[PDB]
């Protein structure tokens, strides 16, 4: 509940990134630390966004904007990421943590998403599934488009895992969460 | 989920404008979901850029009533702009018809046309002004399938460079206001 | 929307400007955009202020700003600019905005602004005078203390311009308000 | 009302300052400019707390002070200033637009403030009275321990100028201000 | 009340780091000192998460933080400090202030807190413990995963000390805190 | 009252600094200028904190933040100050102008505070002292752990001031203000 497998870039050690979201009593405020990029920062923004726009559909209150504060943080504290390829996995937190919706447990998610939640191919595909198979993820979701890249891939890597090509968010949301959301 | 609701709250329009790799297709969102009067803007978005944003949405909420928008709307909403994709920087007024032009679609629920695509530069009194780099822009537009263009009216000077089948292939509006962008993209009259 | 055609300093073209203040709906706000220097910037809250002072006397209740939000804007966009000198532009625009009594089409003005309303000397008279010339501006209001400036001007811009110099703000408004 | 002339530190041209200060509607607010240094900014703040502290006695509502905005302005703006030197004149004009109690206009004065309400030497007082002897202002106030200074300062400047040495914010004020600044005048005969 | 003796990286290195928390009247206001590092200002802010969304379990009124202010200083003042290490501290300062629950005088601990609850391992165990030993902590709690880094600490230092190796949080409140939660 | 002389470094040295505060009708605020280094604006925040914290044992209301502002100043204006030193002085200045008791004019004192009221030591108290002494100040309020750095000072210097070794706010309070609290 509140807490993705997300592939994302990092300037040190994996690529694979545990995103935890908190919802406590506030006063509307978002909070995002994990020594995070701006583009990292700003795909927490879009995300938040594409949870906004989908709220009453979403079984969230359209008005939990106000009596809720919202913390993302992303561990380990001290590591630099960046860029937007936990886009996908910063949305599917933020819809697990706000409906109390658990995320599946072996499912991991690169990706980078839009304000329409279309999910946009990403970078260093083969390094951040070497994460997933070194971190015993058995099904990772992926961007449509990065499905190029599977063939630079070692069939050891690949055998092990369930990859989804995905093209959008609601693919995300019935894949990741466990119940219906 | 809400894929629907995700719809008519995001508008989108292709504009042309400057990226770090040159003049390209871009695709702008714009969300309006409830809240309470803030702005937001993302994108690897340059300075120019983000002033081209506000811009635009000033030009919104001055016509709010003429565009069949509520006046008071920005006082129970908030409003995302963002310009995919996220790791790619982007500067520039030439996105500021298109940022124009998907604020009023989602705030009137007018959604814009397909094989539309547009560029230039936005004042608050409405008027288009002429940008730059439009070969590449028009050369974008054509490669990505894109019919139609909208382009600053002082810019059909630049079309007599653009080659003779790009051109050809491309229905091209040399637009000297607002209005007329509106008009043209929209697939109701406003 | 107010519009008033300024000569100002800019880093790149003509030294001539189109100041546009939009004046909506809102909480209170000020919002400044053009690329602008930090003395333009500064030069937009002087003007401000001085309409803020004057509201009263110009048929403006001095109660607007509570529920209203400003913006002010310089086209084109990515230029550079800055400096004081569209301080008395940006004053007329605000007043043409707030009342909604439109500027003169034919009128370009520079100018820096005091909050007591008086209208101080500005520099490249020459660069901003050749920009109002090459524009088509058929009436340009200068500081007074500029007058002496005229001298070092082409006879033929000076031929074709109509130069009113002026000492405050409210000989510019007069000049520049159609009404 | 709330303009005083200011000797301090300016990087081009005189020592000497006009200082504007406008108190309009509003929320409370307080916004400075003209290319201002940080200490000359941070002057202004310690000459509005100033203000504030002794409300009552200046007879300044304090709700009517929190529906008001206040902007001090240094033209010409372009201009770098910067110093404590300023202070008592900031103190001077904004107990002036707040009061609506004009300065006398043959007046200058040099000084920093404290919130204690006194006044502390400044620097450069011979660069300062050489401004102030341009600009024939005939009365100049300066902080009293400022007069071990006069003494290298030309006879001739000395005497064209009527110098008071000054020792508190409260004997500027009844000196620079037009009106009785604070407390009821009450007559009495023997 | 409000005090916590961290482990925690300084500009000389790790060292006794005494942890101070304040909660007083104000409007939900959060201010963090002592010449701290960016990455030990989000330490704080993921510290103080954890505690507001464990508010009714650790007995504190859910809405707390609804009319008051939270100062954490990290004395002394002019001393550089960062890292994410004074995590365990911070959340343990927290508890012990917003619950009056009293920490234990013998007790020092290092260790980065994530939102859910667990304590990660850090570097710099070494100077860590020998800080500790230095200053008369009897008791020092570490995380799980630093157990092996144990053998690389002098054995007279180590063996002068009461170490537990803590998981979650839970376990660290029990262990400092002077009462039971 | 609202002035204190406290002993602290100074772009000059560690020298005499009249720390002045203002409490005036207002919103919340808290403004400080005097050319203060960060070090110092931090050491403001916590001595307002510690005065927040005991603030109905000192007479003081306490919402009496949430209707006031508060301006700490440091003549000189120009004159850069910065550290942890002035501490204690901030934070009786603090209760001066709050409480309406007036500080004593001959007193001066200097010493790292915290949010616990413990008065920490300071460096440079040679310098700080030859700096009271030559002020005229009759009476010096030092750290308690500072008294061993009495003995690097001039003995004609010491011989005439009126030093009182402290260890915690309490007694800094009882000392230099001049009524009970």
Redesign the interface.
């Known amino acids: 509940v509140g807490?993705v497998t997300g592939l994302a870039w990092t300037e040190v050690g994996g690529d694979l990134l545990?995103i935890?979201?908190?919802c406590?009593?506030?006063?509307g405020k978002l909070?995002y630390?994990?020594?995070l990029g701006?583009?990292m920062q700003?795909?927490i923004?879009?995300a938040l966004?594409?949870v906004?726009?989908?709220?009453?559909?979403?079984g969230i209150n359209?008005?939990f904007?106000e009596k809720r504060?919202i913390?993302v943080?992303v561990?380990?504290?001290?590591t630099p990421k960046d860029?937007?390829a936990a886009?996908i996995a910063m949305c599917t937190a933020l819809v697990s943590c706000l409906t109390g919706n658990p995320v599946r447990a072996d499912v991991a998610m690169t990706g980078?998403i839009?304000?329409?939640?279309q999910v946009?191919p990403i970078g260093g595909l083969k390094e951040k599934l070497l994460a997933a198979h070194r971190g015993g993820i058995k099904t990772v979701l992926i961007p449509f488009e990065n499905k190029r890249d599977l063939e630079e891939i070692p069939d050891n890597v690949i055998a092990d895992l369930d990859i989804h090509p995905v093209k959008?968010?609601?693919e995300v949301?019935t894949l990741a969460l466990q119940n219906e959301?």
């Open positions: 807490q545990t935890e979201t908190a406590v009593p506030g006063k909070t630390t994990g020594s701006e583009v700003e795909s923004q879009a966004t594409v906004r726009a989908r709220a009453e559909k979403l359209p008005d904007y504060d913390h943080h561990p380990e504290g001290a860029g937007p886009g980078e839009t304000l329409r939640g946009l959008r968010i609601e949301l959301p």
